[PDB]
Structures are given as C-alpha cells and as structure tokens.
C-alpha cells in the first residue's frame, strides 16, 4: 500500500504541474 500511495502522490504532483501549465497557456 505504501508504494501505491507514493505513486498516486507522484501522479497528483504531475497533475498540479500540468494544470498550472494549461492555466498559463489559456
């Protein structure tokens, strides 16, 4: 479970970075 949670966290960090970028492009 620890490893699963770490992977989900890394995904959400990526989402924050990606959505902040889209925000800027818009």
């Amino acid at each position: 479970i620890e490893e699963l949670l770490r992977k989900i966290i890394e995904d959400d960090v990526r989402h924050i970075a990606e959505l902040e970028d889209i925000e800027k492009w818009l």
Copy 2:
C-alpha cells in the same frame, strides 16, 4: 491541451480503482 487532459483523466480513473482497492484491504 486535449491530449494532456486525456492523460490526467486516465490517471484519475486509475486512482479511483487503486484507492478503492486500498480501502477494501484496510
């Protein structure tokens, strides 16, 4: 942007499945 958002959607689909699985394990 559309391709990006598709990838995010796919991630969230995986997150719901994994977190639901974790919730049952616990």
Copy 3:
C-alpha cells in the same frame, strides 16, 4: 483513514466528470 480515502475518491470522480466536460467544450 477510510473516510479520508472515500473523500479523495469522490474528488477524483468529480475530476473525471469535469475534465470530460472541458474536453467537450474544447
């Protein structure tokens, strides 16, 4: 923890619904 996980799942379900909508608007 169970309740926290359920809330995160509900958020991600909303994200899927919202991003599918944005997808369509774009």
Copy 4:
C-alpha cells in the same frame, strides 16, 4: 475553464497532503 482547472489544482494539493499524511500514519 480556468476557474474549473484552479479548483482541480486545489483538490490535488489537498490530495498530496492527505495521502502523505496517510502514508505516515500507516
């Protein structure tokens, strides 16, 4: 759309904090 994406970002910020907290509890 920009307002929507901001709300998603805010959610993911909460998710990273909560999942990290869960990861420590476990």
